[PDB]
């Protein structure tokens with residue numbers, strides 16, 4: 001049992017892992033019923049891990065929203081870093097999709113209204129996420145899809161981007177990366193909107209809109225196809241079809257912008 005400020009966890013309660021972090025379930029030391037997720041260094045990549053966790057602290061401490069996983073505390077030292085975060089008792093969207101296979105438009109709408117709420121704050125703060133994918137959308141059950149709360153997690157690749165500048169760091173997960181990102185071009189806040197479009201498509205159909213055998217194949221696919229249109233099922237409602245076609249535009253200049261996304265008719269209650 002390791003401790004971190006007012007919190008503790010055991011390395012036996014692994015709930016998540018990637019190349020640059022490991023996450024354990026834990027609790028408050030006084031209030032045993034307050035569950036937390038404690039994110040730690042992955043020693044296999046010590047230096048990069050330490051750098052990313054440090055950056056994630058800087059971003060997350062500026063974001064307080066019901067649809068963004070909360071940072072309760074953290075601890076940074078020369079040779080160790082910990083983030084103490086909100087525990088999401090529903091697991092991730094990837095697992096939920098594995099079980100449901102596909103989601104109804106009504107569930108998709110509920111989830112996307114919430115994601116949109118978070119992105120509104122990110123966009124207003126000038127922050128881009130750069131690793132949106134089902135594994136980083138988490139579910140919280142306070143029961144049915146109407147009560148599920150969705151929270152964006154994992155801000156380790158996130159950055160401030162000034163509104164007149166472009167980013168160029170190659171990061172994220174290729175299946176969710178905007179074309180401009182995977183083709184090593186400059187990109188902006190609209191790269192996340194492509195990722196969101198891909199997540200929505202995957203919820204609807206159970207697959208990626210543009211599949212390939214490898215990252216390189218996917219890249220070459222995007223390179224060769226200047227006109228690119230996703231296959232949308234015939235049964236899809238008209239507003240959902242419109243939203244997907246507008247998000248999954250290859251060329252970022254043409255792609256739906258934030259204001260269009262936030263006010264899109266598919267999101268109306």
Ligand SMILES: CN1CCc2cc(Nc3ncc(C4CC4)c(NCCCNC(=O)C4CCC4)n3)ccc2C1
Pocket residue numbers: 015016017018020021022023037038039069085086087088089090091092095135136138153154
């Ligand atoms: C099998 N399933 C695995 C995933 C999972 C996660 C949770 N609850 C959870 N709540 C919050 C968090 C976030 C704030 C730190 C969390 N994190 C792991 C899942 C999301 N991925 C990551 O954070 C990256 C993995 C390297 C960082 N996981 C509960 C059950 C399950 C069960």
Ligand SMILES: [Mg+2]
Pocket residue numbers: 129130131154155156157158
């Ligand atoms: Mg990130």
Ligand SMILES: [Mg+2]
Pocket residue numbers: 178180186187188189190191252
């Ligand atoms: Mg862009």
